[PDB]
């Protein structure tokens with residue numbers, strides 16, 4: 030995947046990322062922006078609106094879990110296939126999430142970092158990040174391909 | 175992948191397919207139905223109308239070659255990833271075909287066989303075949319996964 | 320978006336379907352459930368059995384929607400308002416599913432109308448079914 | 461198909477971009493060729509070097525095109541004809557590429573407008589761009 034040069038940049042910037050906040054924001058944007066994803070999150074309660082979604086405690090809670098698994102993915106960045114094999118089994122085999130949605134999340138994730146970091150998250154630095162989020166998406170979709 | 179059954183049923187059906195004509199049709203339906211795909215085929219001459227495309231010699235001949243590697247991947251359903259390794263490298267590294275089009279073509283192939291075989295192409299036989307063209311669309315996409 | 324030729328083609332092809340639209344609508348549903356099993360999870364309350372009363376009876380419904388849509392090609396949003404509400408707001412259908420149904424329908428049409436299923440007609444109906452799926456997946460309330 | 465609310469939110473968002481529309485235009489192209497290298501194969505005649513005045517002047521053209529679209533949200537086909545002609549008929553741009561620029565633009569808007577880039581605005585802008593993209597990628601002349 031990344032070279033050494035890129036793999037370092039990605040690890041330094043990621044160090045600066047506030048996991049509580051960013052995970053919840055990304056999950057919630059996903060529910061808000063691609064509304065059908067909400068159907069996987071009915072149990073989650075009121076997801077009627079943006080305000081509802083963003084302020085749902087379970088959403089906020091779930092976002093964390095997600096970013097946490099990402100942060101771990103960022104530690105096993107050369108074996109994402111391995112790092113995510115369980116999660117691939119769950120999302121794919123149990124939940125029945127279509128893998129096109131995994132791209133959507135990784136993409137949403139990218140917009141969130143850029144919101145929170147502005148000029149700090151540079152064209153150069155985002156490019157490297159898109160390769161990560163695609164790997165994790167590919168890794169997650171492993172039980173299909 | 176397929177089981178013993180799905181495999182022998184699919185193999186039998188395939189014996190009835192005239193590769194010459196069916197490849198040319200599928201390739202041509204791709205170019206007409208999803209017309210951004212013509213940009214890969216510039217050297218093939220006139221692609222200006224549906225009749226041009228269908229009647230184009232270069233298209234038919236290329237269509238023949240397409241189905242040949244398909245018949246081939248039928249003879250190696252067990253290892254599609256090994257089967258399609260060169261073509262994976264050519265399409266992926268040298269032509270840069272977005273893997274999304276591999277699926278369109280696989281689907282266009284399915285509609286063609288249905289056209290040519292009508293009720294003979296049963297809902298149950300269409301099904302095993304969907305696994306087949308998706309198998310194939312994944313092995314070619316391997317230099318993206 | 321549809322050209323004037325796209326509309327012609329759809330009208331013409333949808334006409335040839337005529338009285339067989341309920342049947343084809345049913346065949347399309349059976350074919351989708353069979354090839355793409357995950358779609359069935361949208362019908363847990365149904366008997367998705369071969370020849371189901373319920374599948375058959377639904378396939379009639381979906382076709383009568385598309386016949387109405389063909390008569391309102393200029394204003395699908397206006398025409399399909401209540402079906403968007405259902406598919407978009409209530410059921411929250413992942414849009415990948417619409418592709419799998421539209422494929423299924425085209426596979427059906429091809430097998431029953433080989434002479435009429437030309438690559439020009441195939442292109443025009445593809446775009447038509449993409450337009451309908453967009454509307455049904457859109458929340459324009 | 462956009463809500464009244466989506467068109468509200470798009471207008472709102474685009475007033476804020478205001479006079480940096482060309483700037484953000486350039487930055488989104490710049491982010492797209494960097495992040496998605498294959499998109500470069502469409503600009504073999506370009507200086508694609510970082511800071512190229514050619515990329516800058518083209519972003520001006522793209523943003524200028526989007527601002528036209530914001531004012532003609534009820535007839536994008538009519539507004540964007542000349543541009544479908546180019547993107548679909550002449551250039552034959554693969555549809556996925558429009559996803560890549562749209563994403564890029566969203567990345568761009570996010571980083572310059574953290575306050576205004578609310579999830580709701582995000583949703584609306586996303587829909588807007590998918591609508592523009594469908595237009596430039598349909599052959600309806």
Ligand code: HEM
Pocket residue numbers: 066069070072094095098099116120124126130131134135165166169
């Ligand atoms: C980067 C992509 C994703 C990652 C890393 C990810 C990671 C996770 C993790 C860690 C869990 C919980 C782990 C556990 O609880 O054992 C989970 C659960 C879940 N994921 Fe994801 N997930 C991803 C994408 C998605 C997407 C896109 C969806 C659907 C839109 C989805 C739907 C779910 C659902 C429905 C659950 C279970 C929540 C419940 O209990 O209802 N996941 N995922």
Ligand code: HEM
Pocket residue numbers: 211214215217236239240243244261264265269271275276279280310311314
């Ligand atoms: C399952 C999908 C595909 C298969 C099995 C396939 C197979 C092939 C084969 C066998 C060749 C030529 C081999 C050779 O002469 O070395 C080829 C070349 C080519 N394919 Fe495909 N292809 C597939 C998909 C596509 C798609 C989707 C596109 C674009 C929409 C595409 C565009 C091309 C092009 C531009 C060439 C070079 C053709 C030439 O100039 O001779 N292929 N592909």
Ligand code: HEM
Pocket residue numbers: 358361362377380381382384385402405406410412416417418420451452455
């Ligand atoms: C061209 C696309 C579609 C059309 C024209 C269409 C049309 C309809 C119609 C007319 C109804 C119900 C009205 C009634 O039952 O009285 C309906 C309901 C429903 N549709 Fe669709 N639909 C489409 C796509 C889908 C897709 C892709 C799915 C999911 C795979 C889906 C899932 C459902 C479900 C679960 C119901 C309600 C079930 C029921 O009432 O028994 N629909 N759709």
Ligand code: HEM
Pocket residue numbers: 499502503505521522525526543546547551553557558561592593596
């Ligand atoms: C929101 C989507 C897009 C819009 C509004 C857009 C808009 C434009 C505009 C306004 C022009 C100006 C051409 C002129 O001077 O008349 C243009 C040219 C062009 N667009 Fe796009 N574009 C979009 C997406 C794309 C994408 C995704 C690609 C390819 C990846 C693309 C490729 C081109 C090319 C190759 C040109 C002409 C370049 C040249 O002059 O050599 N466009 N586009």
